[PDB]
Ligand binder design. Structure first.
Ligand code: MET
Ligand code: MET
Ligand SMILES: [Cl-]
Lengths: 275, 100
């Protein structure tokens, strides 16, 4: 299975109610492993997966120093962006940043990412080549000019292809019992009569890992995605995931409807029937 | 400003059995901006012990949080999640339905 390491930063201005809120989280695949919260008492990068606890003091001090430094750059960014967009000083705004790396089954570099949003909209992103930027609006083109002149992309590319991959390997090993597992979904369908003439069919996938899955309905072999209610894949709390997909059907047509499940834990795609 | 409405899911960790300790989850996803209020309710009252995940976001930049607590499903106790967000005119209450 392919794997990823990602950091997610969220910075929110709150004019007159404090300095901006800053929250940082780190993930390996779908498993969170560290956090920082500027409003918390500790003012430390903190562990959130058992397998990171073993890291030594150089690690916690280093990550703490880095995350605080990132909080400060984002604090100043909120001012730069408010100014560029000619926004009022009163309003709350959001900066987001995501970066990290993907490796394949073989733990070799696949892809890197480094990208930003302002108020929920793409702002600037490093392209897949890790050499060039995507910047739609004029404010982001100004940033792009500055980042080109400062050779920012080159520094980011070096992290993403090197250090990022090294950390990802270490964590995957330290965490291998968790991270290098597959839990196949436990599947079933439920039927509930909404009335005398229609029934809700719900196709369930429970207790699966990793999170990627596909659930689809067919009616006499015809894909029903347009008529299907598909919920967002959701955490059970225990490091496994759950998902369901539902269709509302005329009572008596249940046998026409089949649910199709795809997951890496499954030797073969599964079809569930009413029969 | 961009605003995106929370998608609320309220559910148990394990298949529920009356009298058997379990975990009640309220997963809220796809929202923007990040300020949100989320409560788990037992018989309409806020559960005070509730924990939540650290704020994170999806590839589309929308935020997600899991709120969770230990709970014991029973025949007559009603569980729910109550969510408020700038996109909602008033708090949205979603009841736990164990028969889904
Ligand atoms: C948690 S801030 C530091 C994140 C990451 N380990 C880095 O070196 O960029
Ligand atoms: C999207 S936050 C980055 C803004 C950047 N530091 C600038 O000064 O243009
Ligand atoms: Cl944003």
């Amino acid at each position: 299975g392919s794997h990823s390491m990602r950091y997610f930063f969220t910075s929110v201005s709150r004019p007159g109610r404090g300095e901006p809120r800053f929250i940082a989280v780190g993930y390996v695949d779908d498993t969170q492993f560290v956090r920082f919260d500027s409003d918390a008492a500790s003012q430390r990068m903190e562990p959130r997966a058992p397998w990171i606890e073993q890291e030594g003091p150089e690690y916690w001090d280093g990550e703490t120093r880095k995350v605080k430094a990132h909080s400060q750059t984002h604090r100043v960014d909120l001012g730069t962006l408010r100014g560029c967009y000619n926004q009022s000083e009163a309003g709350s705004h959001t900066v987001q940043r995501m970066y990290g790396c993907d490796v394949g089954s073989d733990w070799r570099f696949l892809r890197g990412y480094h990208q930003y949003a302002y108020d929920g909209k793409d702002y600037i992103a490093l392209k897949e080549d890790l050499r060039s930027w995507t910047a739609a609006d004029m404010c982001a083109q100004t940033t792009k000019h500055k980042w080109e002149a400062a050779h920012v992309a080159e520094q980011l590319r070096a992290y993403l292809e090197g250090t990022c991959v090294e950390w990802l390997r270490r964590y995957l090993e330290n965490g291998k019992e968790t991270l290098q597992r597959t839990d196949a979904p436990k599947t079933h369908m439920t039927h509930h009569a909404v009335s005398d003439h229609e029934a809700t069919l719900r196709c369930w996938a429970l207790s699966f890992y990793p999170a990627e899955i596909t659930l689809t309905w067919q009616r006499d072999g015809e894909d029903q995605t347009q008529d299907t209610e598909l919920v967002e894949t959701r955490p059970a709390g225990d490091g496994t995931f759950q998902k369901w997909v539902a269709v509302v059907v005329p009572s008596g047509q249940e046998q026409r409807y089949t649910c199709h499940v795809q997951h890496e834990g499954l030797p073969k795609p599964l079809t569930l029937r009413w029969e | 400003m961009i605003q995106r409405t929370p998608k609320i899911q309220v559910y148990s960790r394990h298949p529920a059995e009356n009298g058997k300790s379990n975990f009640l989850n309220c997963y809220v996803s796809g929202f923007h901006p990040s300020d949100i209020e989320v409560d788990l309710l037992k018989n309409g009252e806020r559960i005070e012990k509730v924990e939540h995940s650290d704020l994170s976001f999806s590839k589309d930049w929308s935020f997600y949080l899991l709120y969770y607590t230990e709970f014991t499903p029973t025949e007559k106790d009603e569980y729910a999640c109550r969510v408020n967000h700038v996109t909602l005119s008033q708090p949205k209450i979603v009841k736990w339905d164990r028969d889904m």
